[PDB]
Structure formats: C-alpha cells, structure tokens
Amino acid sequence: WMPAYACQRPTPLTHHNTGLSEALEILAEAAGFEGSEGRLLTFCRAASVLKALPSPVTTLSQLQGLPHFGEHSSRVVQELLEHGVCEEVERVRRSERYQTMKLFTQIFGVGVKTADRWYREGLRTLDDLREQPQKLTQQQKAGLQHHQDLSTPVLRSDVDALQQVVEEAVGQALPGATVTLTGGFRRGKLQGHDVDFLITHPKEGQEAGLLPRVMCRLQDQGLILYHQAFERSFCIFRLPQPGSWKAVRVDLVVAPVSQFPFALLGWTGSKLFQRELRRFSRKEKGLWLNSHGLFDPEQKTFFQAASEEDIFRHLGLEYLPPEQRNA
DNA sequence: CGGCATACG
DNA sequence: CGTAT
DNA sequence: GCCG
Ligand SMILES: [Mn+2]
Ligand SMILES: [Mn+2]
Ligand SMILES: [Mn+2]
Ligand SMILES: [Mn+2]
Ligand code: NA
C-alpha cells in the first residue's frame, strides 16, 4: 500500500502527521550534525512516509509494514503516541550542540563541517563569529551581514515582485528568454527561505552567456547585494519595500531548452523527492538522472524529454504534479 | 556488508 | 568546502 | 537507520 520510494507516492503540502514527522526530522537533522548521512536519510524517509499517509497515526500497529520504519523510528512514534513527547528528541532539542549547530548551519555559506569546527573551537553565537571576521569567506560574511533579513519568511508578494524584476533583466539581456518560478513555491508553498528561478530560451544555444548579462543588469539597477562563465547564481537581492528594503536570497539558473524539463524537475524538488527519484532511476531502471538529462549508460544516449511527464513515463512512474512532490 | 543523488561555484 | 533541489 |  505504501511504496518504498518517495517518488512513487503523492506527498501533499498539508498532511496528517506533522507532530510525528517533525520529531523524526529533528533526529535526521541531528544525525547530519554528527556526520551520519545514512541515519539522516532514513529518518528523512520515515518522516516522509508519514506525510504520505491518508490519516493521522494514533496506534503503533498502524506502522506495521511501512517502509523505513524499524526499531528506532517506531520507538520514537511509540513514545510520542503514549506520552506526547520523545525523550531522545527533547534531549537533542535542548542540547547546546544541536542549538549551536542549527544556528551556524542556518548561515548562508556555513555547512556542517564548518559549523562543527567552530563549535569545537568554543564559538557559540553569531556575535562570536563577527568578533573574528578573518575566519570568514566572502560568502559567509554576506550571509552573516544579512542573517536577520534572511531569517524572515519570503512571501508570495515578494516572489511576484522579484519575478517582475528578474523578467525585466532577462528580457533586456536576451529577447525571447523566459523565467519560470521553481523551488518550493512551484510546489505550492506559501512561504520560503529563498526564491528559485529557471531561465531558458526556446532556441538552443541562444542562452549561452546569459546569466552574466542578467547579473550585470540587476547589479546596475542596484538590486544585488551579493553574488559570486557560470550557469547557477546564488544571490542576495536588495528587494524594495515600502520606504525601505530587505535582503532576499534568490537562486538563478540558466538551462538550454533541451535540458529544461530536467532542470525544471530537479529545481522543483523537494530535495528528498529528487534524491529518491535519482536513486530509483539508477537502482531500479539503470538510468542516470540529473538536472541536465537522463542517461542510458549502455547505449550511451540521452533521453529526449519535452516535459516532466515524459521523464516520469520513461522511468515507469505515475506522473506527480509539483504539489504532490512535497516528500 | 555497503549504499545512501548529483551536480555547479 | 560551499551552494542547489 | 534501514535495507538490498
Ligand atoms: Mn512509555
Ligand atoms: Mn527555495
Ligand atoms: Mn534555492
Ligand atoms: Mn532548499
Ligand atoms: Na548554511
């Protein structure tokens, strides 16, 4: 009843087991802070299974047979059902290690390995990081300088205003080029931590050199606070606000139209959905999937897709619209 | 036992 | 390493 | 942590 891959089942944005999935995702996050990507994946998968169930779980017996639910994840659910709280989860929640790792890794430019080094060096606050600016890359400095704004949820009004200015810069840089909203907002989310845009042109090859031209034109309009030939740009915008402005993270990607369905699929997510889809592709169908194409390593050929639907079908998967990819 | 998605900057 | 989904 |  429950397939093992997240790409084989609908996962809507609103589901019926937020309490259980949120607890399992704390353990997944903590597993990553300690350097166990395997444990992180399992806990993420178990949480995602609960998001795909049609009703709330109220008895431990409702977990029998579900993939990715073993002794550990079942004990967590069990404790939550009986006592409303899981000791392990609360221990992690309150721990200085978890709180400081979450604080540091939330910084744009800081990952687990960087945050772990700083923690081992005794650092605990953002001010501690500001004290010693020599130990900061230019990317981390931008992330730290705009951390407050970047912690404010991005709203749909922000998306619409951002798309207008991106579309204007793109149109000035290359007539006929298009801008597609991707990421969580394409999956139907009402908030987010950034905005993701995918850019192409209907005539293969015309998009060459586009992203630098777009960035220059945004910078000349005073819209760029930070950015780094390139096809992916992880920026921070200076988004006008009534009488003021706020910093917003914006990802711009350029793809040739031949790759557009694969880039759209990859950049629409969710993150777990794409990992599971790529694992399914390779492990179950012997095909290599990424945001550029779908590769057959035996024939040494690429699958010519015209749409996301074509990709799902070539993989033998029932099509899922973006709003059902919230694994 | 060993894998666990797969790229670009 | 960081980033992205 | 779970599973092929
Ligand atoms: Mn008990
Ligand atoms: Mn996003
Ligand atoms: Mn993004
Ligand atoms: Mn993301
Ligand atoms: Na980070």
Side-chain angles (χ1 to χ4, degrees), chain A residues 2-63 65-70 72-112 114-133 136-137 139-147 149-163 165-167 169-202 204-218 220 222-298 301-317 319-327:
Chain A
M2 177 67 65
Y5 288 90
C7 56
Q8 289 176 304
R9 53 183 190 248
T11 314
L13 180 56
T14 72
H15 64 91
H16 309 265
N17 291 285
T18 298
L20 304 175
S21 55
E22 282 184 357
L24 287 171
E25 289 174 347
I26 290 293
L27 299 181
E29 189 180 18
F33 294 162
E34 305 312 298
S36 179
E37 211 66 16
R39 289 168 46 207
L40 176 155
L41 249 184
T42 288
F43 284 133
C44 285
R45 289 168 179 167
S48 184
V49 169
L50 300 177
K51 303 175 190 166
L53 291 166
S55 301
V57 177
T58 56
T59 61
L60 186 62
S61 63
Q62 290 165 324
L63 301 187
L66 297 181
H68 308 296
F69 268 92
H72 196 146
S73 305
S74 298
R75 179 253 297 173
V76 176
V77 177
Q78 182 183 4
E79 294 187 11
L80 288 163
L81 295 171
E82 303 179 2
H83 303 290
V85 72
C86 176
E87 187 170 358
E88 185 184 2
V89 176
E90 298 305 302
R91 192 163 63 254
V92 171
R93 235 191 276 264
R94 303 168 184 239
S95 70
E96 187 179 10
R97 168 71 178 184
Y98 172 84
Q99 291 174 4
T100 307
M101 289 297 290
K102 187 168 187 63
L103 183 72
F104 288 165
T105 57
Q106 279 175 349
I107 301 167
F108 176 67
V110 182
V112 170
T114 304
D116 167 67
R117 178 172 74 255
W118 289 345
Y119 188 88
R120 284 186 286 101
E121 292 171 358
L123 308 178
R124 295 291 187 273
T125 65
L126 304 180
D127 285 337
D128 295 334
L129 302 176
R130 300 188 176 101
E131 291 182 26
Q132 297 168 264
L136 296 175
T137 68
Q139 185 180 60
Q140 292 159 350
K141 289 171 179 171
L144 203 61
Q145 178 50 34
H146 300 293
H147 181 274
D149 281 351
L150 297 194
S151 77
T152 311
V154 179
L155 306 176
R156 185 72 197 195
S157 53
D158 303 321
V159 176
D160 297 335
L162 284 167
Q163 183 151 3
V165 302
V166 174
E167 286 174 345
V170 168
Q172 294 164 0
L174 188 69
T178 60
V179 184
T180 303
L181 177 63
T182 66
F185 286 105
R186 180 170 184 252
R187 299 198 311 275
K189 288 181 71 181
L190 306 173
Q191 298 186 352
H193 94 286
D194 76 350
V195 191
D196 304 284
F197 292 112
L198 176 57
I199 303 166
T200 187
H201 191 277
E204 188 88 1
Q206 292 292 302
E207 80 298 334
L210 176 59
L211 189 46
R213 291 172 51 80
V214 172
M215 294 305 307
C216 287
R217 280 157 178 79
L218 294 164
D220 289 354
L223 289 166
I224 303 301
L225 293 159
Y226 165 87
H227 79 108
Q228 45 209 85
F230 52 99
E231 60 195 41
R232 302 180 187 178
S233 185
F234 319 109
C235 314
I236 301 173
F237 268 57
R238 173 163 167 158
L239 180 65
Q241 300 261 265
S244 189
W245 61 269
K246 72 175 181 179
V248 180
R249 277 271 298 106
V250 180
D251 293 331
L252 307 174
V253 189
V254 172
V257 69
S258 68
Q259 303 176 8
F260 181 83
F262 304 94
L264 180 64
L265 177 61
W267 280 85
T268 298
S270 71
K271 168 174 175 169
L272 180 61
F273 190 97
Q274 295 303 308
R275 302 179 74 160
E276 294 278 287
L277 185 63
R278 295 172 182 190
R279 185 169 65 96
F280 182 90
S281 174
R282 180 189 294 270
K283 304 297 184 181
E284 302 300 334
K285 304 299 174 173
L287 303 174
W288 301 353
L289 179 66
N290 63 17
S291 77
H292 297 339
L294 179 57
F295 184 73
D296 183 324
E298 309 327 317
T301 56
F302 286 92
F303 174 69
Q304 303 304 295
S307 68
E308 294 181 314
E309 286 84 332
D310 290 340
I311 301 173
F312 275 88
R313 188 190 60 259
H314 197 63
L315 296 174
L317 292 161
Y319 177 67
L320 291 172
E323 64 265 25
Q324 298 299 335
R325 303 179 199 163
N326 292 287

